[PDB]
Amino acid sequence: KVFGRCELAAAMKRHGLDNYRGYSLGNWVCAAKFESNFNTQATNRNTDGSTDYGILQINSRWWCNDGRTPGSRNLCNIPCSALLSSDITASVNCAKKIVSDGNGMNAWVAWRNRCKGTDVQAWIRGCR
Ligand code: NA
Ligand code: NA
Ligand SMILES: [Pt+2]
Ligand SMILES: [Pt+2]
Ligand SMILES: [Pt+2]
């Protein structure tokens, strides 16, 4: 599924991301836009043997298990295929685990580079 910005905002907000650990909703929407272009099925297979999965491009070394990545920690306790679902719940829950495990949103490179310090509210502006 490829989400709209406002549909993704509403789905994220139902799952508690607005103001999660002091990161407003727009931050989360902005991160998804620049990680995956709102596509739940996005994958990026890396040269280090790891893969980035789903709408938030969560990586298979530390966070989810794809069975083929060296160094697997599986800290979200999920198969990476769960992060390719058309509903976002597993991705959102894993993203909250990532922040709970001592990370800011800096853990997402596209957040750092494309959202940090910008008018992130644009990504929710005009939405119900
Ligand atoms: Na994801
Ligand atoms: Na892992
Ligand atoms: Pt829901
Ligand atoms: Pt939830
Ligand atoms: Pt839900």
Swiss-Prot record:
User: Which subcellular locations apply to this protein?
Assistant: Secreted
- Major location (coarse): secreted
One Gene Ontology term, aspect cellular component: endoplasmic reticulum
Q: Give the residues the record marks as binding substrate.
A: D101
Q: Which reaction does it catalyse?
A: Hydrolysis of (1->4)-beta-linkages between N-acetylmuramic acid and N-acetyl-D-glucosamine residues in a peptidoglycan and between N-acetyl-D-glucosamine residues in chitodextrins
Swiss-Prot/TrEMBL GO biological process terms: cell wall macromolecule catabolic process; defense response to bacterium; defense response to Gram-negative bacterium; defense response to Gram-positive bacterium; killing of cells of another organism
EC assignment: the record states 3.2.1.17
Primary enzyme class: hydrolase
Looking at the record, the residues that make up the C-type lysozyme domain are 1-128
Query: Which sites are catalytic?
Result: E35, D52
Q: Name one Pfam family in it.
A: Lys
Q: Which GO terms describe its molecular function?
A: beta-N-acetylglucosaminidase activity; identical protein binding; lysozyme activity
Q: List the disulfide bonds.
A: C6-C127, C30-C115, C64-C80, C76-C94
Q: What InterPro entries would the database entry show?
A: Glyco_hydro_22, Glyco_hydro_22_CS, Glyco_hydro_22_lys, Lysozyme-like_dom_sf
Oligomeric and partner information: Monomer.
Q: Extra notes?
A: Lysozyme C is capable of both hydrolysis and transglycosylation; it also shows a slight esterase activity. It acts rapidly on both peptide-substituted and unsubstituted peptidoglycan, and slowly on chitin oligosaccharides.
Q: Which PANTHER family match?
A: LYSOZYME C
Q: What does this protein do?
A: Lysozymes have primarily a bacteriolytic function; those in tissues and body fluids are associated with the monocyte-macrophage system and enhance the activity of immunoagents. Has bacteriolytic activity against M.luteus.
- Which family does this protein fall into? Belongs to the glycosyl hydrolase 22 family.
Query: Protein name, please?
Result: Lysozyme C
Instruction: Give the originating organism.
Output: Gallus gallus (Chicken)
Q: Which gene is annotated as encoding this protein in its UniProt record?
A: LYZ
